[PDB]
Design a protein around this ligand. Structure first.
Ligand SMILES: NC(=O)C1=CN([C@@H]2O[C@H](COP(=O)(O)OP(=O)(O)OC[C@H]3O[C@@H](n4cnc5c(N)ncnc54)[C@H](OP(=O)(O)O)[C@@H]3O)[C@@H](O)[C@H]2O)C=CC1
Ligand SMILES: NC(=O)C1=CN([C@@H]2O[C@H](COP(=O)(O)OP(=O)(O)OC[C@H]3O[C@@H](n4cnc5c(N)ncnc54)[C@H](OP(=O)(O)O)[C@@H]3O)[C@@H](O)[C@H]2O)C=CC1
Lengths: 543, 534
């Protein structure tokens, strides 16, 4: 009747206006009026319904609740809720999923917060704003304290009522808690969950996503792990690295272990050198003061590059189960001696030669005289049968010459019989600026003018090319999906974390003691010349 | 014009369909694109030869020039080299045969030019090329005729416009091997190169005997006249592209070098298939059989190059040394390791059966098909089955090497399978690996995999293999030619089996033309280490 049609009309109007507002607040048009008109007309011309529910029957047989602590904050609004929106649109959340933002910040108008704050960071609202309103019906806000027994009793009563209204076979409910909070709050809120908001005894798992930093050295990290272990075990904690995507991990694991050709050469008999590189053209972008207490090694090397190394270098796991892979990550990291300062070259970037990038020290939030490294190259030695003597080079840098993340394996040259008509084979696994995996090999030159000794180097693509170029879901979103699926492969385990800090902490101590000081390099160059000399001195050979 | 436009279109799309359906890429769209750009693809001759190739006179003497091979293949191959600028500009070509030719210019124009490839391009060059051709009517066994031939060659060598004296002489025996010893003795006594300078090389045609004893007698008959730097025993089918794929892809690369062994390889198959039968010419195939025709010679050379140890250098004779060394490790083939076939009429009668040929003796048991297992008993290959397969009148024209690597059962189990390396020569050149890869997308956990083909080279269905070998002889590169010692070892691998066959101990199983062959051959292959993909 009139009631149904008029609520539908206001709902459609509000849905359009919410998309317009979100496009205006993101695009920051100087002329709001002009912008709202072009957008409205383009939305008209664009039929958006795409949500094929693709979860397995395990996922939709029990209630699911996702609780985002710190929901008021920068990561929650800009990354976590939009990643949940993407999973929602990809059909990867249960149709009855309940999402609760939990934070201390008072919110007098929860719908406004959902439509004006959260929705602003939902990507691709031109073709998906239709789904945005549906998604937001799954989101509620609990204003509460992280350290209140009573608030967590009240939250539990809210969760239980939704769980008990579930229409599905099993009882209880699964609970995913996301700590979008400073680490200084983790121990208190984990205590609160454990006291007051664990899953109903009648059924359901609990998982807790822990955000970085996980300490800043062996002692501080172990203290945080020790603070959380009376509340959650290692099947429950998920220590997340946003940068480690499913695609690169599967390139590393499957291409080697599924195949005789690559399994057989993944060892010191065949490999001369391994480099893992994380390069950015951006600097610290006005947040230099926050970076100054972290440095490039804690920022991306002790965590992100070291996990890549463990997956690259691990022995064959007993099975493809996640904890069998994490077992081998731990085993291989224990074969690594702590990095010494003679095996490290540090840099600190100065203004780019064209003036477009100011120097690190020119940031007014950076303490005068700071020796914080924005660049590091270092050698790690893996002392076991498979890798003894193989240099493993980790390199990371801000404000260098290109944005680029890759693994580069150089194989030992076949000197005979081709001599100067061949060179080291290479295997490259790239994540940025785009995914690629390929080998560089020596092949014949076609045609009669080419005798046997005339060759060239070619790049053999190792990747499967599908019929259609299908959407790339980002690394972060695949990891939240992994946590929902109960797959801990790409998350750092408690023992794994401790071994990794013990590889890096002596070096970090020496840096903080002043024992090694960064070399200036202009923003936009490769970094210090001493770093490329170091790489050349540690087994790498130019093409 | 429009019905022809439609004709052109439909033709392009026919080729693309055949191309796409042979490669079967999952990315149909981009394969179609690049193969279309590829299909998009006269003129005077630029010389491509080295300065040393044109430093001396060159005479090419084709014995048996009256014959089927000479007119249909040898002279047209020389024509193709001439048009490609691979023959030195002043080359002289002399046909020598017993047949009286009262009128040489007409023999060249009505007989020889008929079989030249009329690529419409080359056509402008035929009368030019014919000016390089003369004819000597003589006996193969006459010393005096070869002295007379020598005087004619000298007159042509002395016309050379170049400082170097003398002349290089390439003699081509397009004759039955029963005449080879006669010709070689006559050259030795009558027409060796001038003493002031020049080499002599002699291309010898197959069959190189028919067993160890007869082959050794032929080699013994020729060795008083020419040594192994002068004799070129040619195999028309062994193209330079396949050989370079075999040698360079392995030995220049750590990745392939390290897995080219029994620790990593489960099975090796070398296969030569044709859809044609013996084509009414079965009478002279009948005393040869498929094993002598293409397996003891062509497939075994491929095998030697695949299986050899690393040569001391890439020099021709270091490679031939290693071909000899690995052939010496091969056990003589047993009758239990050989399945024979003989083709009957196709199911639709389109192809008549082998015995329906009137030139085939009734009740012939000649094999048109054989699959066999060879054992290479050395450190690199012990335990690795090497399967050779050749067949007439089977289901497709196809020539390839297929290497299957040992499966990695752990940890992927049923989500992986054997890797493969394929090196294909027919119907077109290709070289690719098959490995297990991840499947892109969030839908695919670690166990969701795909068997992915990775093309190193892939060409669609340019001097051919034969011309490239004639060029190799002119360049003095013996790599792809079977050496005297190599030849003897190859016959010793095959001769016990061939003798058993000639005494009836195994007999061919019939298979209809157009089928794969006898079902027992595929049973044998499956029983000897080969596994089906997917
Ligand atoms: N792009 C990013 O921002 C990245 C962040 N991380 C990590 O994710 C987590 C969240 O990061 P981010 O959102 O930027 O951090 P914020 O500084 O924005 O804190 C997030 C929320 O937590 C609450 N908060 C802040 N300080 C305290 C405190 N002492 N006690 C209790 N609550 C506090 C606040 O919510 P309220 O006051 O309403 O309770 C705040 O809005 C951090 O651990 C961060 O290191 C790592 C990956 C990327
Ligand atoms: N497509 C083909 O024909 C293939 C054949 N071969 C081999 O090439 C060589 C030539 O092949 P093909 O042309 O078919 O053979 P032919 O039997 O047709 O011999 C070619 C010429 O040699 C002469 N000839 C034949 N028999 C004798 C004989 N007893 N004594 C002296 N001369 C003889 C004849 O010329 P004349 O009487 O004028 O002296 C004949 O025209 C053979 O060794 C063959 O095995 C291998 C590759 C392919």
């Amino acid at each position: 009747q009139s009631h149904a049609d008029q609520d539908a009309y206001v709902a459609d109007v509000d849905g359009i206006l919410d998309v317009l507002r979100a496009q205006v607040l993101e695009r920051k048009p100087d002329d709001i009026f002009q912008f709202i008109s072009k957008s409205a007309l383009s939305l008209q011309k664009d039929s958006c319904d795409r949500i094929n529910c693709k979860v397995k029957d395990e996922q939709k047989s029990r209630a699911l609740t996702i609780i985002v602590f710190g929901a008021s904050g920068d990561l929650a609004k800009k990354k976590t809720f939009p990643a949940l929106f993407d999973l929602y649109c990809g059909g990867l959340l249960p149709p009855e999923v309940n999402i609760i933002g939990y934070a201390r910040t008072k919110v007098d108008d929860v719908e406004k917060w959902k439509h004006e704050t959260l929705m602003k960071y939902f990507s691709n609202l031109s073709e998906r704003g239709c789904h945005a309103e549906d998604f937001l019906k799954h989101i509620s806000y609990f204003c509460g304290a992280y350290d209140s027994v009573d608030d967590f009793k009240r939250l539990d009563a809210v969760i239980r009522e939704k769980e008990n209204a579930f229409k599905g076979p099993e009882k209880g409910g699964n609970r995913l808690f996301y700590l979008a909070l400073p680490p200084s709050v983790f121990a208190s809120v984990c205590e609160s969950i454990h006291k007051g908001a664990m899953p109903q005894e009648v059924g359901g798992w609990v998982r807790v996503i822990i955000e970085k930093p996980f300490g800043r050295d062996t002692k501080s990290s172990a203290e945080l792990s020790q603070a959380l272990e009376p509340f959650f075990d290692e099947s429950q904690l998920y220590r997340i690295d946003h940068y480690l995507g499913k695609e690169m991990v599967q390139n590393i694991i499957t291409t080697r272990f599924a195949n005789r050709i690559f399994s057989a050469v993944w060892n010191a008999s065949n490999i001369a050198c391994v480099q893992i590189t994380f390069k950015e053209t951006i600097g610290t972008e006005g947040r230099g003061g926050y970076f100054d207490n972290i440095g490039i090694i804690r920022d991306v090397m002790q965590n992100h590059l070291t996990q890549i190394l463990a997956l690259l270098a691990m022995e064959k796991p007993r099975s493809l189960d996640a904890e069998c892979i994490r077992d081998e990550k731990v085993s291989v990291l224990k074969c690594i001696e702590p990095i010494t300062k003679e095996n490290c070259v540090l840099g600190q970037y100065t203004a780019s030669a064209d003036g477009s990038i100011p120097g690190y020290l020119e940031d007014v939030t950076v303490p005068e005289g700071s020796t914080c490294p924005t660049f590091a190259v270092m050698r790690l030695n893996i002392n076991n049968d498979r890798w003894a003597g193989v240099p493993f080079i980790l390199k990371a840098g801000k404000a260098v010459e290109q944005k680029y993340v890759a693994i580069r394996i150089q194989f030992r040259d076949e000197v005979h019989p081709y001599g100067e008509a061949t060179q080291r084979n290479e295997l490259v696994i790239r994540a940025q600026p785009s995914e690629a995996m390929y080998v560089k090999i020596t092949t014949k030159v076609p045609g009669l003018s080419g005798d046997l000794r005339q060759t060239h180097q070619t790049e053999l693509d190792l990747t499967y090319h599908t019929r259609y170029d299908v959407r790339l879901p980002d690394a972060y979103e695949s990891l939240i999906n992994d946590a929902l699926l109960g797959n801990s492969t790409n998350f750092v385990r408690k023992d794994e974390l401790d071994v990794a800090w013990r590889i890096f902490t002596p070096l970090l101590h020496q840096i903080d003691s002043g024992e090694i000081k960064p070399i200036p390099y202009q923003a936009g160059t490769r970094g210090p010349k001493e770093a490329d000399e170091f790489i050349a001195n540690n087994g790498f050979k130019h093409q």
